[PDB]
Amino acid sequence: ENKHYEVAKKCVEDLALYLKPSALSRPMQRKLVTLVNCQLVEEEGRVRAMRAARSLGERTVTELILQHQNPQQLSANLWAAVRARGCQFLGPAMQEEALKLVLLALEDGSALSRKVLVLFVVQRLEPRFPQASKTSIGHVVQLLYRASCFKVTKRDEDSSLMQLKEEFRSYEALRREHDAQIVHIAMEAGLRISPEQWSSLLYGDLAHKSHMQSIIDKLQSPESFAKSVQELTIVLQRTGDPANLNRLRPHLELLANIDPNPDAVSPTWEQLENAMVAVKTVVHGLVDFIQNYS
């Protein structure tokens, strides 16, 4: 006898059919299960469902953006940005040894002109890595300078001398500020990159997600659902949108306007119905788009 409840329940059952008693990613599975378990005859269940739907929606936007993202074009863009600010990243093994060699020189509180510091490193990097040039090592040093690792002392008729600050005289402290500056460069160039891409880019493995997450939390605020939809819009403007993903926009906007905060007003049946319809439409879209286009 309740049209709204029937459409809504109908929408949820339909989405349940994506669950194997692997059409979706595991995140989507987790979040879908949450919505499906919601009891729409109770208020605490209608509320929890509005929250679930927003989550599914925000995630859908994310996977769509990720689908358009080429990691080979993305990394070239990272290093271009780095080089455009005078710095370099020589690749996981090489940077490691170089930062260590910097550390080795200045740990004790030694003070060396930039030129003297570069030579020190390059000399000791020769055996394991002969492609090292005074210019490349220079840029690694400029990287550390940009991250404000050095205390520097002016002199007349002779070179300025550089010391590491007390607080960076360890590889943990040094690598952390180093890694942070390369993120800060990513942000300046307008590149959202994920702890897993980062871990892969700087160390060459998936084992530094946690370390990297900690920095991004410190340097960046997470992007609202709203700003993500705007992000996808632009991509779609640039591609021309042959799958008509832009048809999902009304629905994503509806979902993003759901107030997730816990002081929020419970939904009306209408609002609930519209939300379930919206999330159904969006999720179906994601699946169809992945199944039909690369």
Author numbering: 91 to 111, 124 to 396
Give sentences from the paper.
Roquins are a family of RNA-binding proteins critically involved in maintaining peripheral immunological tolerance and preventing autoimmune diseases. The human genome encodes two Roquin paralogs, RC3H1 and RC3H2. The ROQ domain binds to a highly conserved, stem-loop-forming constitutive decay element (CDE), which is found in the 3′ UTR of many mRNAs encoding regulators of development and inflammation.
The structure of the RNA-binding region has an elongated shape consisting of 13 α-helices and one β-hairpin. The first three and the last three helices form a tightly packed unit that has little contact with the ROQ domain. This six-helix bundle was found to resemble an HEPN (higher eukaryotes and prokaryotes nucleotide-binding) domain based on a structural homologue search of RC3H1 using DALI9. The HEPN domain of RC3H2 superimposes with that of RC3H1 with a root mean squared deviation (RMSD) of 0.52 Å for all atoms in 145 residues. Analysis using the Rapido algorithm confirmed that this region is composed of two rigid body moieties, which correspond to the HEPN and ROQ domains defined above. The two domains are connected through two flexible, proline-containing (Pro173 and Pro324) linkers and no buried interface exists between them. To compare the inter-domain orientation, we aligned the RC3H2 with the RC3H1 structure against the HEPN domain and found that the ROQ domain of RC3H2 is rotated 34° and shifted 2.5 Å away from the RC3H1 ROQ domain along an axis intersecting the two domains. It is unlikely that this difference is caused by the RING domain in the RC3H1 structure because the RING domain has a large contact area of 863 Å2 with the N-terminal helices of the HEPN domain, but makes no contact with the ROQ domain. The RNA-binding region can be separated into two domains, ROQ and HEPN, which move relatively independently.
